[PDB]
Amino acid sequence: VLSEGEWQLVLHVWAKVEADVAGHGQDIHIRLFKSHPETLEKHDRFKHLKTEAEMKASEDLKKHGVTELTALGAILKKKGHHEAELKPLAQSHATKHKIPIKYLEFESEAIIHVLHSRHPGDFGADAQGAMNKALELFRKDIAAKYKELGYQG
């Protein structure tokens, strides 16, 4: 679990994300999609965006990133007591979108990369460690709900 201070480190960098959710969302997806192209295949509505220029030009990819980061931020503000928010996400990501738990680890990597590329002076090792811990808590909880809904993460 995370200490209150660890949560505050997480929420301080998240306050920076909220200043430009769409920009962070784009950077995270472009990183994810490039580093791990199997993630772009799972985003089948966007898999026709072959190049970074096409990715950046897509208004609907940008909206999808706001949708996902808005939901993540609500989860983080709940500081571990995110059962409410997790339940629909688990449902859809397990049974509709079919996202393996390992892809959430890919996403956590991309998030941490973007946050330190955009906010050095707010993301040193302690903050990075708190954010890592928070996303790992998230993933472990999603993993559990996957198993309860059936069929492995």
CA distances for 17 relative to 5, 49, 105, 108, 130, angstroms: 19, 25, 19, 14, 16
Q: Which of 11, 71 has the CB closer to Cu ion?
A: 71
CA distances for 136 relative to 24, 63, 129, 150, angstroms: 20, 25, 10, 21
Site string for Cu ion, 53-92 (x = CB under 5 A): ---------------x------------------------
Q: Which of 101, 122 has the CB closer to ligand HEM?
A: 101
Q: Which does 102 bind (CB under 5 to 8 A by kind): Cu ion, ligand HEM, none?
A: none
Residues 106-145 that bind ligand HEM (CB under 6 A): 107
Annotated binding residue 113: no
Residues 68-107 that bind ligand HEM (CB under 6 A): 68, 71-72, 88-89, 92-93, 97, 99, 103-104, 107
Q: How far is the CB of 50 from Cu ion (least distance, A)?
A: 17
Burial of 57 (0-12, 13-18, 19+ CB in 10 A): exposed
| Residue 17 binds ligand HEM (CB under 6 A) | no
CA distance 95 to 147: 11
| Residue 67 binds ligand HEM (CB under 6 A) | yes
Q: Which of 26, 39 has the CB closer to ligand HEM?
A: 39
CA distance 134 to 128: 10
CA distance 69 to 77: 12
Q: Which does 71 bind (CB under 5 to 8 A by kind): Cu ion, ligand HEM, none?
A: ligand HEM
Backbone break loci in the chain, preceding residues, C–N > 2.5 A: none
Per CB under 5 A, residues contacting Cu ion are 68
User: Which residue ranges are tagged as binding site for O2?
Assistant: 64
